[PDB]
């Protein structure tokens, strides 16, 4: 992803859109599914009372990825 | 959008032809309101091939949420997508939502006429900047031009609690008469939009007995 002291190309996952919706795979739970964290993208604010409770929008991908962050953090 | 804290993504100037309503704005459909460079279809959506930056799409679900200076306003709108005007806008919000609750500060409310008024408590917020005040204690009509009365700025201030502003009437003709009635009138807004403010009193200088 390199350039020998030059730009990685930098990591970060953004298949995993809902965080804490779907992620049961570790207390009490041995299922919910790997279609649960990626297609359904507006996890968060849909936990409050009746005020602001709609977005959830913006993620970070890898393998080019960041050109506007973090391309620098080997460039 | 254009005037809330509120949602998200579609790009204009004004009324010419090729205008989508909610802020900001990322290409040429010029300038001025808004917040970000550019003037038409926008997102730093962020996803994809370019989820450094956005997903810029062409169906039109594409995101940025709010107001400012140079993004949808003022244009003779040649700045394509067709057509093709003088026209403007101008937008810049402040937060409103839910409404609840009192908001108090600033009390205190009995020296009659005379000297340096002390505190003088009558309320609001919103404008740019706030306000004025006058010269009081507390009632029916002043006795003019006596030893002064005076100030209110030893009133226990906060500008955008909504909870101190002006009371303007006059004793620019200052008094010593007697009873806690010389000028009073104060009466003015609450607050805030998820808890608002409420009202008190005049401004305050002493009248005695040393008998």
Request: charged fraction near 25%.
């Given at each position: ?15 995993l ?23 359904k993208?507006?996890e ?22 960041k ?9 | ?28 459909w ?5 917040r ?33 200076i ?5 244009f ?28 108090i ?8 006429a ?46 955008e609690?909504?909870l101190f502003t ?5 004793m ?5 008469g ?11 807004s ?22």
């Amino acid at each position: 992803f390199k350039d020998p002291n030059a730009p990685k190309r930098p990591p970060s996952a953004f298949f995993l859109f809902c965080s804490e919706y779907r992620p049961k795979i570790k207390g009490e739970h041995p299922g919910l599914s790997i279609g649960d964290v990626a297609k359904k993208l507006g996890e968060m604010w849909n936990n409050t009372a009746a005020d602001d409770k709609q977005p959830y929008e913006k993620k970070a991908a890898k393998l080019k990825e960041k050109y506007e962050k973090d391309i620098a953090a080997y460039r | 959008a254009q005037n809330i804290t509120a949602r998200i993504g579609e790009p204009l100037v004004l009324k010419c032809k090729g205008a989508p309503k909610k802020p900001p704005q990322r290409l040429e459909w010029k300038l001025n309101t808004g917040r970000t460079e550019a003037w038409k279809v926008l997102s730093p959506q962020g996803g994809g091939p370019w989820d450094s930056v956005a997903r810029v799409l062409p169906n039109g679900s594409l995101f940025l949420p709010a107001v400012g200076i140079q993004d949808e306003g003022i244009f003779r709108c040649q700045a394509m997508n067709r057509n093709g005007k003088e026209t403007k806008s101008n937008y810049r919000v402040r937060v409103y939502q839910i409404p609840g609750k009192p908001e108090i500060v600033d009390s205190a409310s009995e020296l009659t006429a005379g000297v340096p008024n002390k505190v003088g408590t009558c309320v609001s917020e919103g404008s740019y900047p706030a306000g004025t005040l006058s010269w009081h204690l507390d009632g029916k009509p002043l006795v003019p031009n006596e030893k002064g009365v005076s100030v209110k700025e030893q009133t226990r201030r906060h500008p955008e609690t909504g909870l101190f502003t002006l009371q303007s009437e006059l004793m620019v003709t200052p008094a010593r008469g007697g009873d806690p009635r010389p000028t009073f009138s104060c009466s003015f807004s609450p607050g805030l939009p998820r808890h608002r403010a409420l009202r008190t009193a005049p401004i305050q200088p002493r009248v005695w007995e040393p008998v």
